Nucleic acid binder design. Structure first.
Lengths: 87, 53, 164, 89, 132, 154, 24, 200
RNA sequence: AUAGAGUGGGCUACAGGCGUAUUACAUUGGACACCCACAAGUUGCCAAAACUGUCCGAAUAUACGGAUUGGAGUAAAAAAAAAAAAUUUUUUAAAAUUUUUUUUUUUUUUUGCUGAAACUAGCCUCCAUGAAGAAGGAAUCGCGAGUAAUCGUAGAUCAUUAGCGC
């Protein structure tokens, strides 16, 4: 999907710009960004940078809080919001 | 690695230049404007522009 | 110098048969020498009544409403075709034809009509000068036939050009 | 005609043989060892020995399960994401 | 004289045997005929086939109960080439060379009054004689 | 000339109708038609030592290019024993290879019938007659049975 | 797959040897 | 000349030498057939006649089996730029009908192009209808030359060849006039399938 | 609220067991080429199996088979106009061109596809890893001519997804 426009994260970006009132990524490298970020859609992709952000993702029953680290940068956020069919 | 000889494609429009060897005749057709006469105007201009070669 | 082709579409062979016969009556009337006294008739051996086969396609259905996947039945549409051929040299009887098919209404039966004909062409004098032989009769007009209240007596009418 | 290497697949096999010059209709019993030195040198010009790659993909999906990600627990669970008999673990 | 074509064609059609080209089985059976020539003069082909099949004719058939039944000889040919070919697949799957060699060596051995076709064949002959 | 109805409807589970005749034309060249499949064929026979045998333009041995299929072409011609002396001009349409062969075989048989009456079957005398080639005049109009409007269901 | 991925035969099974006509 | 042949045959890790030795033989045989260089120690005695025979010619025109990695892609993504007949050196040198060097101006001067001046390397190629790699089944030839079709096995020699097969033990029996005419109409002049049907 | 919307799941989860199909376990075969072989199917042109040629037969699990899993989304071919022109490559004697090196050109394909969004959970293409499986017991089903089997093909619903379903 890299061809002809590779990234979709608009509502996540609206919340990210809400976080970006003093620093998007600790420009003031990262300090965990204690204000929680709670998205309402997991179809979003993940953009480079975006590190140390507390993302709360919807599972259809709740919001799942997961801290992003360096490995999950080229992913789509719905991969981290399962339906918990453990057994 | 196979394709039909008659592509008969779509998602486009044109003047459709074509020739018929059976009767020794060229064929151009109309597709752009809604009315027939506006297309007759466009292809008449295309015929005049064809004769500039 | 006008050529007419009438194509006709139907579902019951009765109606397309009556349609073919009545338009044949119209053509033979339309160029009829009703009296001798003026004597450029076109029964040239172009003239035909070519019949045609159809487009064989079967479209089947589940008989049952719910489970019933055993329950199949075959169904089917028919299209019966004829083409009507003539040509002539003066336009006033061609207009009698077109107004004749404007009046007589035909039931359930499509009329698609082809009217290749000669019509004269102006040129800018530059290309006539730079002319100084083949067919090159290429206009091929096109018109819509639906979504604007017409049950398809559509007339398509390609044109043939002449500029020597 | 090295359709015969094992640590690699077939298309790269005929690629490495072509990259030192071995055509089709040659057998392993018909290559002098100078070309063996050449093809080994071209193996560290290419990528090497699919168990080195199997170690590599072991840290690759180790990286993926280190991400607390459900494909990680697929790989600790053995479920098709498209025969849990073979796994990458 | 046409029974040569009949027995050969029934050999072809029974050699078809899975869905495919009878061209494939036809070139296969003609390859068996030429391989029969090669092995025969190695260590005289329609001859040995006609002798092999006429050696292999089950004249009276039996039906279990055990009751003998008279048999029209075209089905005698037809059973005959059948028993030849299932013995052929027995030997060839045991060899698992081609089938052409296996049908060749079997047509030679059934010509030589030997082989499992001849064994099955003459036991059902004598067993037809048993239960009268 | 006085030809008559020759046709048959021989098959099982589906009928047939090859209404085409075989006839001699005033060029001294007979013409005939034959289908044995829904794929169909026609022939045109000149007594000649010219190009010999021809279907579909090309010489025969490359068009048909399985040998068994070639003697399926030649089988009425070989049964006749009048092999060489006619130019064989012929056309085919449809189907698959040896269906085309046995179809063109039937058509060649029909043309040979109007060339020589007694070898094969005709409608010259009431649609009856007997020669060696009279068996393969009437076409074997069996087609595929229709793929069953119903189930595998097993 | 009857050689589904890499053949001149199994790709008529996967509908790719017939190249898809440009339509919409 | 055996100098250059043994120069070529000597080694199998410097291939450019071997192929260059081969085509050196090619041009030197063309020169010898030209009659350009007569030796000073030789007798009055005519040189050996150069005949080049090329079975299945258009394999020098179809695409080959050798390919290469293109310079663009990684070896991992390696589609094969298959090498062509003109891209070989040796077969490109073996294009004798398209070679000028049988139409030698040295042989057009010293032999004069006359009927007594038979002084050109006479070269013949035949090519088949069954290529093992996609060669064209015709040869679009720019260089003038004479084409001769091989006709098929006519009826008399089919009967004779069948008699020969009846001799050699490939057949079991003699052929009828009917079956000879039948086989003539069957294979159409194909020799190899006429050999195949010989038991029948 | 057993009524409607909105957003995201779920309707597809996964010890077991069962039903229906497909694909194989090869040599009657695989692969590759061929002519790109002939169809149903010109009405208001298009295949595959095979035929012909060539490679392969070591318990190799084979160059059979193609399930799972990682990874990546990449190449060009065609030819035109001018200036110049008789250059590139080996050993210790040879070879390819009479077109080499510059500028302008230029097509046709190529782009991952379609959708707003393809992680779960689509599909495509190409790498890589290459599983079981060497014909299947007890038991049993289906079908006797253009039939089984095998081979494609095209229609539906469909933005795309049917490879196996019909």
């Amino acid at each position: 999907s890299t061809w002809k426009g590779p990234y979709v994260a608009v509502s996540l970006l609206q919340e990210v710009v809400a976080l970006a009132r003093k620093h998007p990524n600790w420009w003031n490298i990262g300090q965990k960004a204690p204000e929680v970020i709670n998205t309402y859609s997991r179809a979003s992709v993940i953009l480079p940078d975006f590190i140390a952000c507390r993302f709360g993702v919807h599972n259809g029953k709740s919001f799942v809080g997961m801290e992003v680290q360096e490995a999950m940068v080229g992913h789509r956020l719905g991969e981290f919001a399962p339906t918990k069919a453990t057994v | 690695a196979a394709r039909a000889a008659a592509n008969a494609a779509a998602y486009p429009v044109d003047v459709e230049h074509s020739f018929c060897r059976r009767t020794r005749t060229a064929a151009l057709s109309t597709a752009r404007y809604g009315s027939r006469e506006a297309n007759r105007k466009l292809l008449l201009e295309h015929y005049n522009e064809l004769l500039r070669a | 110098a006008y050529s007419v082709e009438i194509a006709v579409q139907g579902f019951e062979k009765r109606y397309v048969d009556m349609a073919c016969n009545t338009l044949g009556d119209i053509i033979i009337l339309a160029f009829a020498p009703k009296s001798y006294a003026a004597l450029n008739l076109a029964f040239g051996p172009e003239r035909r009544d070519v019949r045609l086969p159809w487009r064989r396609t079967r479209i089947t259905l589940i008989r049952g409403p719910h489970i019933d996947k055993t329950g199949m039945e075959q169904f089917e549409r028919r299209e019966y075709k004829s083409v009507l051929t003539a040509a002539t040299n003066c336009p006033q009887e061609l207009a009698r034809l077109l107004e004749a098919v404007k009046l007589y209404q035909f039931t359930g039966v499509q009329i698609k009509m082809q009217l290749a004909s000669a019509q004269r062409v102006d040129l800018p004098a530059d290309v006539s000068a730079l002319l100084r032989x083949x067919x090159x009769x290429x206009x091929x007009x096109x018109x819509x036939x639906x979504x604007x209240x017409x049950x398809x007596x559509x007339x398509x009418x390609x044109x043939x050009x002449x500029x020597x | 005609a090295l359709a015969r290497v094992f640590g690699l697949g077939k298309s790269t096999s005929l690629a490495v043989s072509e990259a030192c010059g071995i055509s089709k209709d040659l057998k392993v019993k018909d290559v002098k060892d100078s070309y063996i030195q050449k093809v080994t040198a071209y193996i560290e010009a290419n990528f090497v020995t699919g168990d080195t790659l199997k170690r590599q993909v072991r840290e690759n999906v180790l990286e993926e399960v280190a991400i607390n990600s459900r494909r990680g627990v697929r790989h600790t669970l053995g479920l098709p994401v498209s025969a849990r008999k073979l796994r990458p673990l | 004289x046409x029974x040569x074509x009949x027995x050969x064609x029934x050999x072809x059609x029974x050699x078809x045997x899975x869905x495919x080209x009878x061209x494939x089985x036809x070139x296969x059976x003609x390859x068996x005929x030429x391989x029969x020539x090669x092995x025969x003069x190695x260590x005289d082909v329609l001859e040995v086939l006609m002798r092999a099949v006429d050696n292999c004719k089950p004249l009276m058939k039996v039906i279990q109960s055990y009751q003998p039944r008279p048999l029209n000889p075209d089905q005698s040919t037809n059973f005959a080439v059948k028993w030849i070919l299932q013995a052929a697949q027995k030997r060839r799957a045991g060899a698992k060379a081609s089938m052409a060699e296996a049908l060749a060596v079997e047509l030679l051995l059934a010509a030589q009054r030997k082989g499992g076709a001849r064994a099955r064949r003459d036991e059902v002959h004598k067993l037809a004689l048993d239960n009268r | 000339s006085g030809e008559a109805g020759s046709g048959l409807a021989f098959p099982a589970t589906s009928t047939s109708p090859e209404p085409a005749g075989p006839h001699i034309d005033l060029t001294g060249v007979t013409h005939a038609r034959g289908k044995r499949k829904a794929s169909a064929a026609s022939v045109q026979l000149v007594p000649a030592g010219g190009a010999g045998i021809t279907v579909n333009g090309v010489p025969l041995s490359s068009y048909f290019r399985d040998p068994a299929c070639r003697e399926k072409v030649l089988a009425p011609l070989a049964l006749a024993g009048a092999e060489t002396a006619y130019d064989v001009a012929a056309r085919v349409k449809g189907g698959g290879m040896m269906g085309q062969a046995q179809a063109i075989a039937t058509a060649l048989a029909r043309a040979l019938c109007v060339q020589q009456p007694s070898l094969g079957a005709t409608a010259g005398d009431g649609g009856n007659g007997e020669g060696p080639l009279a068996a393969m005049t009437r076409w074997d109009g069996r087609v595929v049975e229709r793929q069953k409007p119903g189930q595998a269901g097993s | 797959g009857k050689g589904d991925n890499r053949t001149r035969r199994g790709k008529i099974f996967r509908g790719t040897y017939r190249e898809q006509l440009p339509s919409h | 000349l055996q100098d250059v042949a043994l120069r070529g045959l000597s080694s199998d890790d410097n291939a450019q030498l071997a192929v260059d030795s081969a085509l050196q033989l090619i041009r030197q045989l063309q020169l010898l057939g030209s009659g350009a260089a007569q030796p000073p120690d030789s007798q009055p005695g005519q040189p050996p006649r150069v005949l080049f025979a090329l079975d299945d010619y258009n394999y020098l025109y179809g695409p080959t089996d050798y390919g290469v990695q293109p310079p663009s892609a990684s070896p991992l993504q390696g589609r094969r730029r298959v090498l062509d007949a003109g891209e070989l050196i040796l077969a490109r040198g073996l294009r004798l009908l398209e070679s000028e060097l049988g139409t030698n101006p040295v042989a057009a001067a010293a032999a004069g192009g006359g009927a007594g001046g038979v002084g050109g390397a006479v070269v013949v190629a035949a090519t088949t209808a069954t290529p093992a790699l996609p060669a064209p089944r015709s040869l679009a030839l720019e260089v003038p030359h004479t084409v001769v079709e091989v006709p098929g096995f006519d009826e008399a020699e089919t009967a004779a060849a069948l008699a020969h097969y009846a001799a050699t033990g490939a057949a079991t029996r003699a052929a009828s006039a009917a079956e000879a005419r039948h086989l003539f109409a069957l294979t159409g002049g194909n020799g190899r399938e006429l050999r195949a049907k010989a038991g029948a």
